[PDB]
Amino acid sequence: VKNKCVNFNFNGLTGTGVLTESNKKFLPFQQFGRDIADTTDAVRDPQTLEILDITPCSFGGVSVITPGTNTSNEVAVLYQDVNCTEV
Amino acid sequence: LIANQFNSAIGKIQDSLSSTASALGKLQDVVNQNAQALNTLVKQLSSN
């Protein structure tokens, strides 16, 4: 399954992400991919050799824009760093 | 004469910046310091 925050467990390694068809070219024998800080970033599908990405499914703070309650009980929320289709 | 000197001096600044980059060490140092702080913070996650 792709494009959903899933809790994957590929053959050895686990973790939660959003598997997406990538364009990275592993070497024939490599399995993982890592980031500059040693975090999993690409996994080779051990059944069909298509290299998928791993995007940690969106999190982020929630702020509450508000005029003072001395003005009105109305607010507006701000979700930080989301494509605004995941709310 | 003052006009010519001022224009030529601006030009020399342009060149000095365009050729060597170790003049901007001050900003780059801040950016690198924060990048390394974050990288140490993250790499602490892989310790027992």
Partner: peptide, 22 residues
């Protein structure tokens, strides 16, 4: 000349570079 998984959010600066330039 001048050149993510664990809550490390990087907020954006309130004044964007165009407004600084202005």
């Amino acid at each position: 000349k001048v050149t993510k998984f664990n809550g490390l959010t990087v907020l954006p600066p309130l004044l964007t570079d165009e407004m600084i330039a202005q």
